[PDB]
Design a protein around this ligand. Structure first.
Ligand SMILES: [Mn+2]
Ligand SMILES: [Mn+2]
Ligand SMILES: [Mn+2]
Ligand SMILES: [Mn+2]
Lengths: 288, 285
């Protein structure tokens, strides 16, 4: 039985990603958010509700990535150095999830926070989104998995945090770019800095697995990947309509979703499928 | 589907352990090992070989804990806050494993290091040890597991890092307690500091599951736990004889194994089953 040996490279990238993930390590106590209260109260009830709902959804995604996605993918990887990187990434998903609770403790009462998490747990589209993604992870709950199954779980993982999440990162970035909730915006930018390299790394692993497949299996997962992309896109358009109609941002959020879907495809070595638009300039200022 | 909500406690201890795990965070590059060369060369060939072999075995343990044990236990937990703690622990197991390579890079040539890892991969006792432990984890690769299966995986985890690899920490601590290889000893102490709280935490989770089992299931896992304890002990006794006879430390290491087996039992809320070396104790300072 093999032990991980870092003095002999198993690939050309795992060490670099290990060092980068460790270098970027942070926790929620590093950013004080109390100063956001002054701009929080300047928002409308509908704006506050949208903010809490999108952060509720982000918490769900990170809960599933740290608790199902990364662990089940990494268990089936044979590269021990890449496994190490995924374990660290999985830990950071739990830091991400906890940091949203750090924001909530400042911006909401205990009753209001209970309301958020109850709404998350019962929401039909969130359940549908999460259910489709985690079904790919659940297929890995067996002693031996096929590379097709492992590839598609990697695709699901890239789509979750390079793509599906951004319907949610939009609004904290949009507000931060307008000078509102900027401390919470600093936290969201730390999360995005992590997820950027999470998606690149998993996409590299996926491309390596894809190249190992038979031609028949490659054709199957190529088609399944494109179907999944557009299945999730249809659900995300319904979600954006539900969350953002009240505050007049549906089409803006949809453009951001398409932008990040193209990024997820490129992380997988695949061509863009949506027209190449510029990032919303207010969002861009929030990423600064 | 539920998201983790840290503003409402799911238990009375997960936050306490989250904060402590975080507070103890460290990486392999914090301790420079170069100064150990001066005491390394003063060891005999037999002492150097034993050192490299024990550290190879420790690496295997952490490779298995971070890549199999922690992920498969955590994926079946219902408590999302406890899940979070275990995910962080699993990440630290990879820090542990990488830190042994950091030591090797200073103390061994490239060819010698590849010899170590070849010896680890083909060693029959290490294969048997790891195979017994990871068979409890492999049982968790299915969509529905029983609480007996999850309990026994937690038992195996506690035994792995409260018990079954102290046959290995003995020698780094023994040398460090004599002023030899003290920088590597500092790394081992950071690892032990983590593993102390890993075993306690998984032991708490195990006791919580145990209390939900029927009386019949409790009887059955109690028997399996005591038999596993002694199956591993027999293998460990053979391992210590193989590793330490050349340097005259078999009986000392065996005493240390029994002491830590008792600690693993206590982490599970169980009574001790066996009736510390003072130089090892000085290496823990
Ligand atoms: Mn994340
Ligand atoms: Mn991620
Ligand atoms: Mn460890
Ligand atoms: Mn451990």
């Amino acid at each position: 039985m093999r032990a991980v040996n870092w003095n002999k490279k198993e690939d050309d990238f795992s060490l670099m990603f290990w060092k980068q993930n460790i270098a970027q390590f942070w926790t929620e106590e590093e950013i004080a958010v109390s100063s956001d209260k002054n701009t929080w109260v300047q928002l409308s009830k509908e704006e506050q509700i949208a903010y809490k709902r999108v952060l509720g959804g982000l918490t769900l995604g990170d809960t599933k990535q740290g608790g199902e996605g990364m662990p089940l993918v990494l268990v089936h990887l044979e590269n021990l150095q890449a496994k190490s990187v995924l374990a660290f990434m999985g830990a950071m998903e739990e830091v991400h999830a906890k940091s949203y609770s750090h924001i909530f403790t400042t911006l909401a009462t205990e009753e209001e926070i209970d309301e958020i998490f109850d709404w998350v747990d019962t929401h039909p589209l969130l359940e549908k989104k999460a259910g489709i993604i985690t079904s790919y992870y659940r297929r890995l709950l067996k002693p031996e998995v096929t590379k097709k199954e492992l590839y598609m779980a990697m695709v699901a993982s890239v789509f979750l945090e390079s793509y599906l999440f951004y319907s949610g990162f939009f609004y904290p970035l949009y507000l931060a770019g307008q000078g509102k909730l900027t401390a919470s915006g600093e936290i969201i930018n730390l999360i995005i800095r992590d997820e950027s390299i999470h998606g690149v790394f998993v996409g590299i692993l996926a491309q390596q697995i894809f190249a190992e497949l038979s031609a028949e299996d490659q054709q199957e997962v190529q088609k399944e990947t494109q179907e999944l992309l557009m299945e999730l896109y249809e659900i995300e358009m319904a979600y954006t309509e539900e969350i953002y109609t009240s505050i007049g941002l549906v089409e803006d959020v949809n453009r951001f979703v398409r932008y990040n879907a193209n990024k997820g495809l490129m992380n997988l070595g695949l061509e863009p499928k949506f027209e190449e638009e510029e990032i919303n300039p207010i969002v861009l200022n929030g990423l600064r």
